[PDB]
């Protein structure tokens, strides 16, 4: 059922079964125990050290595969003490450090090391024949296609003459593509980004700070090079520089719930110099760092930042990132969020329905919905039909997929049918009818 009364606790029934009924290696136990919101500290971290002596069989595998919230992998043995047999190898596995060197080993064995240019991917020779915009597209495409390979054919050879073919914010995103070209190469990628950290342009320097964040995304390095470089820019006088440093920290320290990174970021939302873009990117970065952790200082500072803002600032497009940072901090958490729905209820109409639907959607993601969805459905077709303001239920469709992402694939079996004979069959002008993102979000293959 939808309510977290059997959905999130019926998972405890199989837990003993692994633990002591079938084989005791607990290799599948970690998988099963991740399901209950990946509580971990009181559910897994307390119940996988016991096996230990199956370090060659289960421990060698289950530890290395683990790629979720990461402190716990580095919370045992690792820097904790490493008394745990093979601590130093278990920490090198849980930290994903080997992505770069291990990923580049696979990339040599598959004979795919050679960098590809955007034109090879476009196949402009098979195309039967605003430069600022074009360059920007080819910068992102070069980044995505050569991601984590440590080598390209665009920014390596003549990258200064590539950056200055973009304009303004496009130079920030072109410089950031160097980070994402070397995604997970923390040790080599910093040396390629360094050349841009001393730029005479705030856009290029901010994009290089964002590149340092991107390179560390999903990899816990013992030297903390993301925190150690981005810290000094979080409260910077310049906005363009703030954005690159703050989003760089949010990408470098995602899932770590690092008090020393959060205490550096939380004051930026209250700074008089922060634009609504900087405040939104700060709440977003805090919500990525503290994802699913229910962090109280992130929750309170974001709720306060929403309550202190005028209805004229809450109408800026970037204000949508405040309840996103809030919803990410409570991702998976179904019970914990009624207090946050309650606190958000005080906000006026333009932001409250959007904020409440976004936080509720993030809490109870995955779980089959049959009754709350009815309300979601009843909060999906019957607001704008009889009122002047034609924006009240649009995002409700957006999150319709949320809570029905891959629920044993029969929700998707109907979700498209639910959306099939729906708004597109009879919807509205642009508000609800813009369910296009929903179909995309439904599946990723």
């Amino acid at each position: 059922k939808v309510c977290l009364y059997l959905t999130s606790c019926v998972n405890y029934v199989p837990e003993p079964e692994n633990s002591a009924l079938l084989r005791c290696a607990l290799g599948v136990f970690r998988k099963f125990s991740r399901f209950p919101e990946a509580l971990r500290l009181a559910l897994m971290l307390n119940d996988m050290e016991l096996v230990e002596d199956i370090f060659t069989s289960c421990k060698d595998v289950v530890v290395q595969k683990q790629m979720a919230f990461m402190l716990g992998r580095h919370g045992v043995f690792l820097e904790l003490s490493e008394d745990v047999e093979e601590y130093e190898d278990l920490t090198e596995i849980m930290s994903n450090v080997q992505l770069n060197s291990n990923f580049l080993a696979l990339a040599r064995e598959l004979d795919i090391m050679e960098p590809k240019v955007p034109d090879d991917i476009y196949k402009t020779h098979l195309e039967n024949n605003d430069s600022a915009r074009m360059n920007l597209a080819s910068s992102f495409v070069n980044g995505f296609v050569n991601a984590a390979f440590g080598q390209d054919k665009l920014l390596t050879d003549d990258g200064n003459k590539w950056l200055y073919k973009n304009k303004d914010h496009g130079m920030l995103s072109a410089a950031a593509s160097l980070g994402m070209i070397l995604l997970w190469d923390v040790d080599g990628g910093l040396t390629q980004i360094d050349k841009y950290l001393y730029s005479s342009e705030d856009y290029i320097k901010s994009g290089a700070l964002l590149a340092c964040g991107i390179v560390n995304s999903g990899v816990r390095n013992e030297c903390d090079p993301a925190l150690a470089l981005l810290s000094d820019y979080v409260l910077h006088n310049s906005n363009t520089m703030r954005l690159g440093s703050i989003f760089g920290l949010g990408l470098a320290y995602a899932g770590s719930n690092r008090e020393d990174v959060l205490t550096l970021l939380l004051p930026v939302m209250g700074d008089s110099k922060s634009s609504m873009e900087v405040a939104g990117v700060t709440a977003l970065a805090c919500g990525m760092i503290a994802v699913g952790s229910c962090n109280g200082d992130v929750t309170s500072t974001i709720l306060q930042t929403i309550m202190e803002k005028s209805e004229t600032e809450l109408k800026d497009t970037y204000a949508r990132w405040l309840p996103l940072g809030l919803g990410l901090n409570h991702l998976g958490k179904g019970e914990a969020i009624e207090a946050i729905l309650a606190a958000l209820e005080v906000v006026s109409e333009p932001f409250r329905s959007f904020a409440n639907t976004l936080v509720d959607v993030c809490a109870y993601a995955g779980s089959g919905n049959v009754l709350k969805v009815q309300q979601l459905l009843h909060i999906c077709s019957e607001h704008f039909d009889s009122k002047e303001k034609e924006e009240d239920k649009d995002k409700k469709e957006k999150k319709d997929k949320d809570k029905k992402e891959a629920p044993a694939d029969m929700g998707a079996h109907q979700g498209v049918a639910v959306l099939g004979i729906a708004l597109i069959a009879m919807g509205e002008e642009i508000g609800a009818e813009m369910a296009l993102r929903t179909f995309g979000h439904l599946l990723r293959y």
């Binding site: 130093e88 190898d89 090198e92 450090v97 923390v186 040790d187 910093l190 040396t191 360094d194 950290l197 001393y198 390095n221 013992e222 030297c223 090079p225 150690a228 470089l229 000094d232």
Partner: protein, 37 residues
């Protein structure tokens, strides 16, 4: 222009120190693997 020169000099000495620490950790990691094989 002076503030940005002091800032870029502070950033530099931070990056040059981080690159040395990353290289030292990478060499320690490698030395453990190469001794196991």
């Amino acid at each position: 222009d002076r503030l940005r020169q002091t800032e870029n000099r502070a950033t530099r000495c931070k990056v040059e120190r981080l690159q040395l620490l990353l290289q030292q950790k990478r060499l320690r990691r490698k030395a453990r693997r190469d001794a196991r094989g």
